[PDB]
Amino acid sequence: QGDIAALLIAAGADVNAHAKGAFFNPKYQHEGFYFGETPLALAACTNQPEIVQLLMEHEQTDITSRDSRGNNILHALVTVAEDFKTQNDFVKRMYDMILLRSGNWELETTRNN
Amino acid sequence: QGDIAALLIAAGADVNAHAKGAFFNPKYQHEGFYFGETPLALAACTNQPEIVQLLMEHEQTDITSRDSRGNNILHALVTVAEDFKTQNDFVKRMYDMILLRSGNWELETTRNNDGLTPLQLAAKMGKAEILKYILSREIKEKRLRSLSRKFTDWAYGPVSSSLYDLTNVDTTTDNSVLEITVYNTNIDNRHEMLTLEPLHTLLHMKWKKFAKHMFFLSFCFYFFYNITLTLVSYYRGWLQLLGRMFVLIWAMCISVKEGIAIFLLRSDAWFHFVFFIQAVLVILSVFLYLFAYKEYLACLVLAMALGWANMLYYTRGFQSMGMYSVMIQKVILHDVLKFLFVYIVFLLGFGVALASLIEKKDCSSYGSFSDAVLELFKLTIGLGDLNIQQNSKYPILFLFLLITYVILTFVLLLNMLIALMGETVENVSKESERIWRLQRARTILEFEKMLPEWLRSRFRMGELDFRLCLRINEVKWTEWKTHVSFLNEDPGP
Amino acid sequence: TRGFQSMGMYSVMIQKVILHDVLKFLFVYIVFLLGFGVALASLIEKKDCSSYGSFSDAVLELFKLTIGLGDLNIQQNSKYPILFLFLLITYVILTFVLLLNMLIALMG
Numbered sequence A: 001q002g003d004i005a006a007l008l009i010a011a012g013a014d015v016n017a018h019a020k021g022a023f024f025n026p027k028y029q030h031e032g033f034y035f036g037e038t039p040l041a042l043a044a045c046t047n048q049p050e051i052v053q054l055l056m057e058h059e060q061t062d063i064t065s066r067d068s069r070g071n072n073i074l075h076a077l078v079t080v081a082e083d084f085k086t087q088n089d090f091v092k093r094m095y096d097m098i099l100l101r102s103g104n105w106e107l108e109t110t111r112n113n
Numbered sequence B: 001q002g003d004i005a006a007l008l009i010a011a012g013a014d015v016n017a018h019a020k021g022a023f024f025n026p027k028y029q030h031e032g033f034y035f036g037e038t039p040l041a042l043a044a045c046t047n048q049p050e051i052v053q054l055l056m057e058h059e060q061t062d063i064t065s066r067d068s069r070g071n072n073i074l075h076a077l078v079t080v081a082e083d084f085k086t087q088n089d090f091v092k093r094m095y096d097m098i099l100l101r102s103g104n105w106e107l108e109t110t111r112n113n114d115g116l117t118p119l120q121l122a123a124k125m126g127k128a129e130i131l132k133y134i135l136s137r138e139i140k141e142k143r144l145r146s147l148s149r150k151f152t153d154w155a156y157g158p159v160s161s162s163l164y165d166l167t168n169v170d171t172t173t174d175n176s177v178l179e180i181t182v183y184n185t186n187i188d189n190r191h192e193m194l195t196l197e198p199l200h201t202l203l204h205m206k207w208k209k210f211a212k213h214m215f216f217l218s219f220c221f222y223f224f225y226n227i228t229l230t231l232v233s234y235y236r237g238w239l240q241l242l243g244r245m246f247v248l249i250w251a252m253c254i255s256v257k258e259g260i261a262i263f264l265l266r267s268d269a270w271f272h273f274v275f276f277i278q279a280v281l282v283i284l285s286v287f288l289y290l291f292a293y294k295e296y297l298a299c300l301v302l303a304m305a306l307g308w309a310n311m312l313y314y315t316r317g318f319q320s321m322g323m324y325s326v327m328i329q330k331v332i333l334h335d336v337l338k339f340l341f342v343y344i345v346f347l348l349g350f351g352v353a354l355a356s357l358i359e360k361k362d363c364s365s366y367g368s369f370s371d372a373v374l375e376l377f378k379l380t381i382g383l384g385d386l387n388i389q390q391n392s393k394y395p396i397l398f399l400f401l402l403i404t405y406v407i408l409t410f411v412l413l414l415n416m417l418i419a420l421m422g423e424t425v426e427n428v429s430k431e432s433e434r435i436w437r438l439q440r441a442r443t444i445l446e447f448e449k450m451l452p453e454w455l456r457s458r459f460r461m462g463e464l465d466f467r468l469c470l471r472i473n474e475v476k477w478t479e480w481k482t483h484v485s486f487l488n489e490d491p492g493p
Numbered sequence C: 001t002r003g004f005q006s007m008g009m010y011s012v013m014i015q016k017v018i019l020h021d022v023l024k025f026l027f028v029y030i031v032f033l034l035g036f037g038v039a040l041a042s043l044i045e046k047k048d049c050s051s052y053g054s055f056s057d058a059v060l061e062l063f064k065l066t067i068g069l070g071d072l073n074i075q076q077n078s079k080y081p082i083l084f085l086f087l088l089i090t091y092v093i094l095t096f097v098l099l100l101n102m103l104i105a106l107m108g
Helices: A002-009 A039-044 A049-057 A073-080 A090-102 B002-009 B039-044 B049-057 B073-080 B090-102 B118-125 B128-135 B177-182 B197-235 B239-262 B270-289 B296-315 B319-356 B369-380 B395-428 B432-450 C005-042 C055-066 C081-107
Strands: B150-156 B159-164 B471-475
Touching: A002 A049, A039 A049, A039 A073, A049 A090, A073 A090, B002 B049, B039 B049, B039 B073, B049 B090, B073 B090, B073 B118, B090 B128, B118 B128, B118 B177, B128 B197, B177 B197, B177 B432, B197 B239, B197 B296, B197 B432, B197 B471, B197 C005, B239 B270, B270 B296, B296 B319, B296 C005, B296 C081, B319 B369, B319 B395, B319 B432, B319 C005, B319 C081, B369 B395, B395 C081, C005 C055, C005 C081, C055 C081
Parallel strands: none
Antiparallel strands: B150 B159, B159 B471
């Protein structure tokens, strides 16, 4: 729901929320779904580029955030990424768009835990 | 003629007529055309969906009718259905439309005159394209969702878990789908039906739960039985008399069990016969050893060699060795004995020919027929020596026949055997991984049958208006539809 | 043999053949050899009149027979010569015709 999410953040939602539960940070591939536990990483790793643009245009958004694994958004996009036979390479385009919209070298040179 | 049929039923035609003739209920595939002998089943099995809608909208139509075979319309649609290469899957869509327009569970749970539902009939005749639809049937909209067999209960992102129904598909009932598709003998594509979605994991779960330990336990018992038979046969007091007792009682138990296994089945049963002969020879040697006959040793040696050859039955259980064993079986069937027939006729045709031109101090090895075929058999496995100074009147003809034998066997036949087996090894290698799984599922189900009335606390997941289900988790970044058909709001377990 | 491409690819072919095919054949050949050795050594009665006197000599004489060395004599000191000959012919069919020639087709 892109329009409902836009109406949510236009009403004063928190875009820097962290879903640090056990489902969102699982141990194996079928207990949950690790995506980076931010709304921006969720919109990135589910092929929703319009909400990614709308979240990055919001000036309260913290792109250089680090989660419980120490990962920023680019580590999460690497962790979600797979072959071309499974997903038709939207992850490379999301990496390109987010790195170009950042405009600096801080995201690429950040170490995780 | 759809319009003429509409004008016929609008003028007072009978939609519950039964074409119960001999042409419409034939015996073979070319005398007639079995379709279910109702107008609704005829309009269904000939890809006329408009007349099917028009017939089902008629309130005088009896959808739950049963014909002379006891079949309703769904058994008939199963019976007509075939592959995708013959018909472009209209039968699955007709099944879907008729079952959804029914709106209840009466058609699916109706037995015919053989006592089979449409599910068991599709499993019996081996029709994987309609079976894959029936086993995993997700009806999306509400007001008819008890009609489903799959249930996507939660989904977050690409992750989703689903619940497959297991009511008539599990061995807890009498004549189940899995037992039908495993023990089927008349159908060729069983190994394309066991790879379906609530069956493939259902076999893995009971392999991991109890059947692996039971298979290993049976392997250890048969190995100790063969060792105790082997040492007793090879070395022929008070401490080592229990071993002969363990040989005897296990031989009697195996000959009982394999005998009552053979006499209820009436390729897929070879190892039952070989285990039975290996158990019969031991007790036959015991009965001849209690007499004064010295022919007990000929039975004991045959029971020992066949007993050690029987240990290749336990090469299933490992995938890497089970596929090798089914390669061995396909090579024995397709190539080896076909070579052996031609080699035997060449050997026995040249043996008399070489033994005929020998005149007579044992000056020649080729004195008779038996010595000539022995000397020709030693010459093709590369043993001994080749001497041509025999006691023949025509040495050049003897040499010419011997060179013709060497060309015909060593150059032609034995080296064509390798090139011919390369073809079948190429052919079976994309198929043998499924033949091994089919060979393993039979031992799965026989070990399931061996269990008592209790000890079947090994059944599957609980009640969820409550059916025994089965969780299967899955992930796919392909289509990205929003999820409105979940059974549970909170995703995780 | 790495450092040369033409010999390095041959060496990794050697390694994949050792893993996938050779020892898989060797297991079945060992169980056939040691299953027929006791069977042939059992029906021997007794001047060293027979080569198949014990288990070790029988598996040696069956091992020499599949690499094509020596001679094949069937006038042993057995009580049942026809059963001895039948077991020996079954060994020749099972190893020389079936197993060794399926090894080539499987490694291909």
